[PDB]
Symmetry: D2
Subunit: 351 residues, 4 copies
């Protein structure tokens, strides 16, 4: 089979690989729709995942089951499925401790284009079909469903880790796809005021559509000062770090109130470390909790988010700015995420 892989650091291209085979509990799936992610860019041009050879990229996809192992019981060839980017090995001690995302290792739950060929191929492998797949609703637009696989679950997890209270004020730093879902998730957790930080026009409009009551640009001064002016020197209850460099941590700590919570859902791929401003962090005693984690995956997570979409709790269509038709457009779409044109949020390739 043919697949769009990473020939090597800073190098991409199509390669020829043998079709993956399913174990007794797995499934081989063919993509119906896929979407490039900021991670595919990190992994290649930033070596976020060290070096890799002939590895098929991509981890956001909806598709059709074409083959299932003999022990698979809830899925059969022909089924249309939503594939969460995170597909944990459910039989590990990390799962027993309540952290499937790190089953068998840190971030190990995230297999596609991590240490397992991704979805940008004619076919791809899904471990434990019954535990990691969800049926795609009959009338659901492919472009929308693809947003569930990573954008929705990650953004929403940002709001969950933030332990938002009804009426809490929230600042979302970064208004790209993930940050936009962080805003929507924050609203669906009862957030009162929601301040989105970003400037890309199409993103600013989407941020407001999802719930942002205020928008701040870095170009108008220090974000912390801006936030303080909007909150009359009180600061905000919660901060969700969805984009930017390591400097956003320092900003989150400075604008968040003592006893507040900072939730990171941004994948930091550059630099040796992130810095916590001592004074603003109350010298480590201001109860400004710092959290951060990979989006939950698996069947239950996918079905629950899917149902939120079916019940119109969120309109995912506003995330899709570009739609291509044809496997041949994968390279074009991915390169779109690399150059980051100003009118882009997410791109979906419909085979």
């Amino acid at each position: 089979m043919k697949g769009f892989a990473m020939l090597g650091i800073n190098k991409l291209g199509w390669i020829e690989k043998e079709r993956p085979v399913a174990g007794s509990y797995d499934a081989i799936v063919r993509p119906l729709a896929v979407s490039p992610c900021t991670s595919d860019i990190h992994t290649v041009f930033e070596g976020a995942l060290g070096d890799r050879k002939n590895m098929i990229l991509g981890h956001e996809a909806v598709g059709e089951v074409v083959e299932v192992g003999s022990e698979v019981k809830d899925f059969k060839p022909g089924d249309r499925v939503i594939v969460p980017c995170t597909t944990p090995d459910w039989r590990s001690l990390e799962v027993q401790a309540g952290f499937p995302q790190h089953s068998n290792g840190m971030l190990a739950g995230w297999k596609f284009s991590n240490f397992k060929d991704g979805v940008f191929g004619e076919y791809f492998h899904v471990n434990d079909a019954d535990m990691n797949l969800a049926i795609l609703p009959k009338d659901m637009p492919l472009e929308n469903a693809v947003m569930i696989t990573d954008m929705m679950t990650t953004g929403f997890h940002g709001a969950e880790l933030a332990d938002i209270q009804m009426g809490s004020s929230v600042v979302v730093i970064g208004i790209g796809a993930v940050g936009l879902m962080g805003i929507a998730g924050a609203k669906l957790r009862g957030a009162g005021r929601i301040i989105g930080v970003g400037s890309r026009p199409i993103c600013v409009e989407a941020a407001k559509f999802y719930g942002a009551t205020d928008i701040l640009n870095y170009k108008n001064g220090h974000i912390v000062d801006q936030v303080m002016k909007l909150t009359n020197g009180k600061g905000v209850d919660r901060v969700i770090m969805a984009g930017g460099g390591s400097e956003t941590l320092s900003q989150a700590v400075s604008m968040v109130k003592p006893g507040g919570i900072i939730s990171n859902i941004n994948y930091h791929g550059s630099g040796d470390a992130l810095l916590i401003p001592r004074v603003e962090w109350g010298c480590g005693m201001a109860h400004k909790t710092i959290k951060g984690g990979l989006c939950p995956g698996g069947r239950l997570r996918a079905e629950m988010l899917r149902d939120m979409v079916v019940y119109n709790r969120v309109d995912l269509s506003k995330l899709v700015t570009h739609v291509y038709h044809g496997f041949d457009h994968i390279e074009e779409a991915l390169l779109l995420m690399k150059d980051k044109p100003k009118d882009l949020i997410k791109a979906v390739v419909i085979l």
Copy 2:
């Protein structure tokens, strides 16, 4: 001054009383708009909290500060305020334990028409003004603001105790004002499917307006069976008990899944046993947690809920089906809550 009070069990009437005076940290407020509650009915006609003599009723109001003690710093005569129904004594060990609703005693945080003269008077007393009042926004309709003082805070608390997860299925038993806010709150906590139980046309319409995806009527069969039918025998993740008799506890336990949560915000009492069905409760080992608590109050809660309204997180105008004017309408409006006509949700009397 005059005040509409509970002369005794099953006895109402206007009485003459001495105008309360403000202590160093208190405020005397004159009502601008009030609303009768089912709690007033339970307390009077059912004596759900013991006997009372000459106690002015009502605990839902918006008003004008007419006097403050010498130590009050954030409120002054002339300010328009939202008065939360729960006004705790913030200097108590229960507060240090994290339960303001019970400062100095069970339910003692809720004073108005409990053990303190209520708001159905020319003037009423508010303890610790700086900690228990919130400013009324200039453009906010008085009827809507009154819904914050109890309905919104209680309904949302029901959704808070329920510890709802993104996509959780929820059943709200009782779709009166409290249940309606329970529904709205459930949606604002990320609920996917929301099943409302009730039949009054006006309430059914409001339930769907707030987020109900399904409506069930007792006349179509046992509620538990219906819920099992809608869910293909799987039950629901959460249940919020907002209205109905004590038997709804049994229904909640029977329809909720193991590991699920039942949240009570229904002021029980009456004269019917609160029974937990043993088999359905897993003999006490099915992790079906049961919670239930008086709504949070105080300035912070009022300001946070108020801000949600300002940011259009919820439209409270749908709760008000009747608006009257003048003190000489408090009685009629209260009797309306007793007769419970099919066309009533909440009534507000604007003075």
Copy 3:
């Protein structure tokens, strides 16, 4: 093979059943030491979970692995292991929801002598060995290790569900083995005052040994009245329901403070008699949370508990008052639990 089973309600006796067969991921284990439980009694003589036929009893055992399936990697023949009484199917949505105890059904995580042949046989079956077994320390007495399988995990779970705070006062209703572990558990969570309820001398000295600061005997007045006198009418922060009839729920509600938590780990007999007292429960608004659940199981739990014992965090030897040898004595031991002598806590049968 031979096995002591429940022929049917009120009927017990040795029978010749089929020998369990190990699937690719299971293990066949031969018991080295077992212990009868009150649960066996409820199940047989009370049909608390439903009638059964020729079901081998017992769910508390330590044993030797004699056979493992072809896919088992961490255990092999010859290994001595601690078998937790709760062995969940780890590949289920309940597990994905965070409740292994109810994998594939309410209480379905607890298989042995629930709907699967128990440990009172020449050999027994353990589903998914790699996920449900733990190595037995070389120097750990068999009698002590058997206490980890259910008594320790259940008692500690009551303490966990109780959400005890540093200094919290706690009442443990019932000082049988489960309550004793509830007491030890409470101390190990930071409890200050710990009031144990019971009268058997042997249990009384064990309770104090585990941390009880006060012991209440029924013959000195009703338990609620005693606790209220000991606490000057203030009640206690937490209540763990370990033993007794269904009236203990009401007693727990009556002595727990507003905002308190009731933790049930008592497998309840029959009826529904789980009545909640309206007034003491603040009409459902006193924030008196009621929790209750089946003990956690699986490999991780058994290893974590095992390590607590190895590090002397709790001395399990005080739970064993009777030790017998040989399969023959399984019947004698079990009947001992039915008669509930005053000198018994737990009995262990070493094969």
Copy 4:
């Protein structure tokens, strides 16, 4: 009156200063026993205090009430009391938000020698006596009681913030007084293995007395490596940072397992900021939660910890290595905390 104050950065000495007077809700207390703290050192020599002039030092004390305001009801002249180092203003929004430690400002709950004259004076002031004092048991040694004021509440808070589970492995970095209580607290939260990091012989013995199952010294290799060796490459569930510099944060992140929790109770008074290692932190998605907070204060906290001591849950005497008699020894005891002789843990001055 006389008081041992800070005459200026890196300057100490006795001074004459006005004796405080009690507000209507305050009390004036005369010290019975006091103890110098590492904070007194940072404040005077590290200037993390933002510098001050003629400020009386000390915040750890037990004493006698000699005067109360007209509105004080639960404490009267002659009462012996435990004074928590943290004495918040209980009437504030931060308290309503659940964070007394920061009422009216970040760390504002800590008043003594922060922005209010400390306890090293003939008399000192306590705001809101009824909410901020606890009665000192008649038979409790003054030296032990003083350890409750900060060491115990802080160390225990580290264990509380760590949200420890029964059997969790815990590493405590720093075995000075605070870390010693972090170890005791961890044990009292059900920790299995507890690894203490320190080298001072007197502290190492104390560490083992309170529950340390292992002791690691920096002089034997990278602490993370040493921990991995003990844990066979799996790391630990929890880490409590109780001593050392900002490098402990990096070590904490590296040794804790994904999904683990890092609890900081160490006052960081040097450096521009603390650094989080990007890779070890899973690029911000390893669910390695970071917490850090000032110890709780107030009457409830003090009574609850006090009762734990009364019920022998922890023996505080092992923290007191030096005992002096006489006000004139405060300077000597304080300098002891500066020079840090090897046989020191905590010094108490009994007036």
